[model samples]
Target: VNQSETPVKHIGKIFFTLGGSNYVCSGNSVTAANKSTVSTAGHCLNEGPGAYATNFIFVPAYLNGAAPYGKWTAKALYAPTQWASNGNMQYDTAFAVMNTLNGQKLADVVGSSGVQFNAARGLSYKSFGYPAASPFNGESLKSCSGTATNDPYNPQFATQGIPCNMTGGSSGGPWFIGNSSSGYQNSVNSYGYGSNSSTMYGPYWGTVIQSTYNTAAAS
Candidate 1:
């Protein structure tokens, strides 16, 4: 996919500090009431029942060390309390309300992916992100596409997975319905089970994540 293009341009690299160690992750600009929302993973924003991360920033169209859209700072961050209190994999999604840059909002700069919740299971998806781990430099944007399957180990979480090899730093990346990033975003890149796993799991977009989105969108 073209990283410098619309919708794809909305996905970017997330840089922050967690437990005194700098970390990298993936996130995307999303449709919101405030038009300043960034969607990602709960662990990217908080320690899962621990302290929240500091210095969180989103760099859209981040490629080969170039931040074509500049770095946007988070004014407020949110995640499901379920994830915050227990680190529940079922509620791993997070959102950030970014401060306006200059005078324009995030969505106003880089277009946002339409968002959807309470979506059906086992649908097809196109997951986009920057996998800043081994074999992946995390410098260029990447994507994987496939139909989703229920988590084999924890179906009780109602989580699902798609055939994808995206690695760490890919967490929090947006999963769009169908094969295009311009489609409605239904989930995020959350976890994978084993080494060289071909499946990437994301929490179901149920009521919990919907409410989290509500809070962030309104804030």
Candidate 2:
């Protein structure tokens, strides 16, 4: 796929700090009320075992060391309260309302991906992210396409897995319903089971996630 695609161009690198050095992850711009929303993993925003992250920023369309869309800062961040309390994988999604760039909003500048919740499973999906570990240098965007299936063992919270090999840096990348340029953002890269070498999992968007998106997007 071309790098200049719609939502593809909206996906980028997330940079923040915890107790150690800088950390990197992946995220994507999404359609929202404020037009500044960026979706990512819960752990990407908060330190599950520690405190909230600091100096967080998003670089849409990041390539190598170049930030094509420039770095945007976070004005506000929100993850599910359940996740805040326990880092629960079922509520592992997070969203960021970015500070406007120049005089424009993020969606106004780079466009955004439509978000869908409570979506049915058994559908095909295409995942996009920057897998900056090992064989991937996180220099360019990469993707995986596969059908989804429910995790039989996750009785605590609902989650679905797809055939994808994206590594750590790809944690928060978007999982959409169609091609890169014209897909609705449904799920996000959440975690990998130790037992599955080529599969990835994401929290299913239900009523709670709809509430989370509403709160953060309205912020």
Candidate 3:
């Protein structure tokens, strides 16, 4: 299961422009209650520090830099109210709503992996993303796996782990707890840095994410 690949069916491509450069991010389809939605890290949706984003669109099953499944302009974008109001890096989670696909709603594209809120101490996790930084040109999927370590700030928000070496563009990637069968997405790739690249961090999908899911789903 270590070599298992996350199905394209559950993946979504995020496109946005920053400082004259096109940035690509990743998200996953999720089903919350009866609503269909996509999930990603909040910073991916907002520029933070009072900067807002534009030209946001979602392409499901995107491959080879192509949107074969069709592109959906974001009807609305949402981030944790705290992040929106206070610029708190810890509340870096976001969601977007799309019109529909093939006469079906966005939620119908794929079911969301269940969310595990409690601290995932000693849990092994596999993270996937399209890192656009130097070595990784954001053209292909990249992955990293390691046991979670205690987070430095607000242990309740996230956990730390071996550096995945992924950069800014990797934000919003899904962090899976187990194989697709029994595993679920416990966090979304939030942030990382450094040369030794000894650690990466992700937000814990606890109440904050759950609320985001619920609110987005209701919309």
Best model number under TM-score: 1
Q: Each prediction's TM-score against the native?
A: 0.95, 0.91, 0.83
Superposed by TM-score, candidate 2 places the C-alpha of residue 131 at a distance from the truth, in angstroms, of: 0.6
Residue 8 C-alpha lDDT in model 2: 54
Residue-wise C-alpha lDDT for candidate 2, range 101-144, written one tens digit per residue: 88889998888889999889766788887777766777777888
Candidate 3 C-alpha lDDT tens digits along 46-139: 7664554676677666666777667866667778777777767667778776667677776555545666666546677887766667766666
| Candidate 1 lDDT, 1-219, residue by residue in tens | 223223267898999987788999999999898999999999899998777788799999898888888899998999899988898989999999999998999999998988999888989998998888877877878888889999888797789999887889889999999988789999999999874578899999999999999999999
Q: For candidate 1, which ten residues in a row score worst on lDDT?
A: 1-10
lDDT of each: 0.88, 0.81, 0.67
The TM-score that candidate 1 achieves is 0.95
The TM-score between candidate 3 and the true structure equals 0.83
Looking at candidate 3, the ten consecutive residues that score lowest on lDDT are 1-10
Q: What value of lDDT does candidate 1 attain over all alpha carbons?
A: 0.88
Ranking by lDDT: 1, 2, 3
